[PDB]
């Protein structure tokens, strides 16, 4: 359905583009103008950002019982991919020219949830595999240089206005489960962490799964189930009257 | 049944949290206040404690038939985990900011038996795996610094049996304050952290000072004031009916 | 982000300048007016300040078992650096003019912590390295004359107004550590030396690491931990009540 | 935590100090009164004691097949250390002033086993190292003059077991003086240096005369008067409640 960057997503629909223009690729990566697509992608391994360790040990330190280090220089890794070998396609000739020239160019990866990842690098490997029963493939590797523009850099924090639990009042029979739904206003809230707790464990118990609250009526009576947001700025109280079987 | 640290337990329900507070993380790891959860964990490999060898041999030793060594410097290793890639959540944005900054921060692992493990470290790797028929995953590695705080350090501690708020029901006149007292059973509870929150801020407001809760009746009516312990295992709900002047 | 001349700094961002003017170079080394930069520095080794030994021995001294000497004439050393070879730049042309004329000129080394070192000298060596797979480099050596202007010469001492330890009161459980932070008022205090001691070592022990104080509650009870500044003009007393497990 | 000089100790925790007082550095090296620490020591190399050769042969000896010699003049060598470059610290400014002046001053090395070595010398070299990925270091070399004071010279000494201040609690009226007595256990302690300091100067002031402490109640209230030994291994806290006239 509608892409949502706050929910888990499957890889199908991921695309790869290379920048051709003379502007800033980092300014607005969401526009496809001056970008060329590399179609027929079979495998994609994005670059891995790593860092080295720096020693922070001194002789006059009280004790060397445990090691102490800090973050050093950072790297953007290497990005690898595979494509259907089509020498007549313009994008593949452009990639070959990129490899031959040796300059640093910008490439972006587009995900089915509406976000993009932008990297800059130079081509370091070109390969090919030939098999009688399979389609000939082209393997490409790009060494990245500098700090990339990850998708999290384009994410906007949104504050909440209120929290609602539905339904507010419900009766549960012993040995049965009831479903409670908690919602945040508006629909664009970034922080949706919350804790559902039971005042009386014997009278009722609560289990949290996603946005659904399950209540078990172990003992009959009236039990209050408070719900408090993770930030703790809002609160919701749900009253359940457990009915004996 | 009841979580028992003296009998074997299975891994389901292991959670991971990162510290956002300014106090001592090691002081009260059992309280969930000032901690943020990294939801949707797929794989988790804790850091391994390892110590180096130190040679303890001399030329004048009479018995050189066998080797003699001793324990040297101790290390905490690296902790790795995998999450579902959700760039729109605050947790992963905070993780990316933590990696970019390069500082050393504290995190904790909560086990299904009621114990916690606390580490201090810095992020050293960020990765991504993309495939057609599986959820895109984010792989994170953290290098630990210093002395960790394992569960065995907190083995002699007294758990709580219940939490009570007194008085339960009270009426407050507009422009006046009411005092509420929260107590833990038994008197030897070590973790007494709690959070008092208001369902309706306009109807009433709450201020926390020590073990006393102050309620101001800004607007007349019936307002529910839930109280949840810092660990979040108990809950107390106090109902106050504000009376107009 | 933190131009602090009182804390350790890595070397990246260090720059080299040569004076081109008629005014006094030592008077205002913080201004870049009338200074020309030498870009693309690859390696830098500053001058080493040394001294000579003068024999203070006499025939009539009773104690001649041990040698006695004194300080003699002092030298400024030699400064050697390497740049990227670009004969078209004006700075490299001025360097060759400086070598050919044989004049004694002033040069500055600017460090990433906001401090500068100014020297005066004459060029003694000009070299080059040619490699097929490496960029051609220019090697320069300057012999310094006279007393230089070190960064410590421009440092201004600032007195303190008060010392605070935070938090003042804390309770520690046996087998756990507590962090204490000591601060000086104002933020520009030059002398931040302090000794923090324990009145009762069995009841508690203290370890000093940087500005953080670690307290171990070996024995339960009330223990006073006095901290005295290195100058001894201020004093801070921290009381910790150790709680048995 | 094992200060035993009869068995081997690792080198972690060695500290460097410089004398500032006008007394005798060799009289009580254990006390840290009038000494300043040089923190952030990356590497240390103490001076080496060496002796020259003196020819004792003659023409009339019946045996001349083998050479015969004797011990000549003695030298204390050169002590070389490396610190982190922090020009804002008062210690490095004082070190630079020491190098510039040419005076011969005393310095101390303290080992983790509880022993001290005292040398007298003058600075002979000042160096610097600049690297992009490494902290800037300051290299110092000192040439020693005269006879040093090794730890083996102080192999006969009485360690202190405890320090007591009597009386612990006292009330002083404004405009009156109170006498406090400090004692060391046992009666044969060799190092009896101590520092008595006031947390609040306005509330009370302290003067040190011999083993008697005089307290003046300038302002009424409760004031803590910590007392710390010169070595700093013991601490005593005396609380005085000043009563208004």
Curated annotation (Swiss-Prot), chains A, B, C, D:
Protein name, per record: Tail tube protein
GO biological process, one term: symbiont genome ejection through host cell envelope, long flexible tail mechanism
Lineage: superkingdom: Viruses
Pfam families: Big_2, Phage_TTP_12
BIG2 domain residues: 160-238
Subcellular location: Virion; Host cytoplasm
Role description: Forms the phage's tail tube composed of 32 hexameric disks. When it encounters the appropriate initiation complex gpM and gpL, it assembles in hexameric rings that stack on top of each others. Multimerization ceases when the correct tail length is achieved through a mechanism dependent on tail terminator protein.
Gene: V
UniProt keywords, alphabetically: Host cytoplasm, Viral genome ejection through host cell envelope, Viral long flexible tail ejection system, Viral penetration into host cytoplasm, Viral release from host cell, Viral tail assembly, Viral tail protein, Viral tail tube protein, Virion, Virus entry into host cell
Signal peptide coordinates: none
Assembly with partners or alone: Multimerizes into a structure formed by 32 hexameric rings stacked on phage baseplate gpM and gpL. Does not multimerize in solution without the tail initiation complex. Soluble major tail protein interacts with tail assembly protein GT during tail assembly.
Organism, scientific name: Escherichia phage lambda (Bacteriophage lambda)
Ranges where the Big-1 domain occurs: 203-245
Keyword Nucleus found: no
